[PDB]
Amino acid sequence: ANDFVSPDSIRAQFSAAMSLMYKQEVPLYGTLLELVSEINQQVMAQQPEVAEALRWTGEIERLDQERHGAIRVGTAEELATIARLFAVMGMQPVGYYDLSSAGVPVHSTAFRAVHEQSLHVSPFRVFTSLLRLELIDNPQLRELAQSILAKRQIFTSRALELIAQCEREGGLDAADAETFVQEALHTFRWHQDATVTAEQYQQLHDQHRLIADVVAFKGPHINHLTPRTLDIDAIQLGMPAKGIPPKAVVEGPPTRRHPILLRQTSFKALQETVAFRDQQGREGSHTARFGEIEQRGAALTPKGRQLYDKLLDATRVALGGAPAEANAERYMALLQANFAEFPDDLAQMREQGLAYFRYFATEKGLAARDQEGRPTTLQGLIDAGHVHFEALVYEDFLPVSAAGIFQSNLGNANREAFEAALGLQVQDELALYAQSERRSLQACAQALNL
Numbered sequence: 485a486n487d488f489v490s491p492d493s494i495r496a497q498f499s500a501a502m503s504l505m506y507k508q509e510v511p512l513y514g515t516l517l518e519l520v521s522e523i524n525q526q527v528m529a530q531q532p533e534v535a536e537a538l539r540w541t542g543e544i545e546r547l548d549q550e551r552h553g554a555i556r557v558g559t560a561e562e563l564a565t566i567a568r569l570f571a572v573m574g575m576q577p578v579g580y581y582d583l584s585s586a587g588v589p590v591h592s593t594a595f596r597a598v599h600e601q602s603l604h605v606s607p608f609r610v611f612t613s614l615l616r617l618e619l620i621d622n623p624q625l626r627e628l629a630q631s632i633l634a635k636r637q638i639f640t641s642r643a644l645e646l647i648a649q650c651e652r653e654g655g656l657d658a659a660d661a662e663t664f665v666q667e668a669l670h671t672f673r674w675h676q677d678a679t680v681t682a683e684q685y686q687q688l689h690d691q692h693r694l695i696a697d698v699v700a701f702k703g704p705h706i707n708h709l710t711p712r713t714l715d716i717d718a719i720q721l722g723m724p725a726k727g728i729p730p731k732a733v734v735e736g737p738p739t740r741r742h743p744i745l746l747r748q749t750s751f752k753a754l755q756e757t758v759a760f761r762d763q764q765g766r767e768g769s770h771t772a773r774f775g776e777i778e779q780r781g782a783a784l785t786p787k788g789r790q791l792y793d794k795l796l797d798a799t800r801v802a803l804g805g806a807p808a809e810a811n812a813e814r815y816m817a818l819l820q821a822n823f824a825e826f827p828d829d830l831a832q833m834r835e836q837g838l839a840y841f842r843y844f845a846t847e848k849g850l851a852a853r854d855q856e857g858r859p860t861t862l863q864g865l866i867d868a869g870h871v872h873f874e875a876l877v878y879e880d881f882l883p884v885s886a887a888g889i890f891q892s893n894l895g896n897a898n899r900e901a902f903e904a905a906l907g908l909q910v911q912d913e914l915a916l917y918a919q920s921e922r923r924s925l926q927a928c929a930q931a932l933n934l
């Protein structure tokens with residue numbers, strides 16, 4: 485037909501380019517990647533069941549480069565335009581996170597691909613928050629932020645041209661995709677020179693460090709990039725030795741044979757300097773960049789997430805409120821005890837409808853595909869070894885803040901306001917998981933001549 489490259493391939497290239505840029509800016513991220521690779525190879529060598537699970541789902545091939553990014557934007561126009569940028573790469577808005585509950589003036593979505601085959605080529609996802617200036621009570625500070633954000637243009641003209649070209653023509657060829665990746669990178673690069681005066685930065689920062697992070701810079705720099713490890717417990721044991729001691733509180737469920745959602749922790753990655761126009765030849769302020777690591781397990785159904793939320797809430801009530809480093813050991817013990825009630829058996833997770841799964845025809849099943857008298861049900865085919873299943877991996881967010889901006893774990897006027905700013909409706913991640921499960925069953929039925 486045409487010579488356009490796949491949006492999935494652009495996404496993979498963009499993720500790799502973002503990772504190279506971030507590693508140049510934050511060398512301890514490179515240190516983390518080396519540790520992740522070694523941990524992951526150890527798991528696959530020592531745990532054949534994990535290696536086989538990743539083979540069945542195709543995740544073995546996506547794992548090494550799998551990342552998420554997090555960014556914050558300041559205006560509705562920025563959010564709507566960034567949705568168009570991400571669409572070039574097959575990254576659509578999935579989910580709505582209203583973080584005003586946890587005491588942060590933002591609401592968010594995650595831009596990512598949605599179909600198992602797309603995700604196999606690249607599962608790159610960018611959690612994108614929009615600052616809500618109307619939640620800044622001090623009028624003078626809100627007016628300052630609005631004035632500063634209105635002046636900035638976070639996209640290069642060439643990036644905007646290529647986005648419009650992609651929309652009008654239906655894609656980009658390889659050369660234009662390469663140009664697009666490099667132009668898009670400018671939006672996310674770190675810029676030391678703040679766009680405000682030293683005093684303006686001071687006012688923005690004391691209200692909330694997140695407000696200065698958004699308002700005082702040229703654009704939405706990478707807040708962090710997070711690689712995927714197969715064993716967060718193991719990586720935590722290796723991190724202090726590399727100068728990235730992480731938080732003892734691990735967000736998410738406790739250690740499980742069959743992980744659910746994701747587990748996360750964070751560390752201090754770099755102390756950065758911020759420079760101002762009015763105070764040159766003088767010491768500029770400093771700001772910390774935080775890193776993160778995650779392990780991704782099974783996507784949960786509504787019923788599964790209700791159980792997860794219940795047991796996590798019970799853990800927090802038993803602790804007395806806020807999990808902190810000072811009570812980390814007690815919290816982790818309470819977490820393990822309360823989550824004993826969440827089945828840690830794939831067969832029960834499936835039969836009780838707690839997680840999503842993908843199903844696959846086995847070699848034994850394929851060899852029998854012309855036999856009569858085979859089992860008449862899905863369970864019978866599983867029991868006879870004709871169908872194999874594995875959990876469908878979670879692609880979304882608890883969410884958690886590496887920089888400690890909000891309390892962890894979350895998910896109509898606010899949603900309507902978000903979607904009006906975004907320019908479209910967010911997709912339902914749970915519906916998308918159900919569709920992936922259903923597609924696997926249909927492919928299995930065809931492969932087995934059922």
Ligand SMILES: O=C(O)CCCC(=O)C(=O)O
Binds near residue numbers: 884885
């Ligand atoms: O912008 C932030 O502070 C955190 C964004 C959410 C996130 O990255 C995660 O859940 O891993």
Ligand code: NI
Binds near residue numbers: 776886
């Ligand atoms: Ni993150």
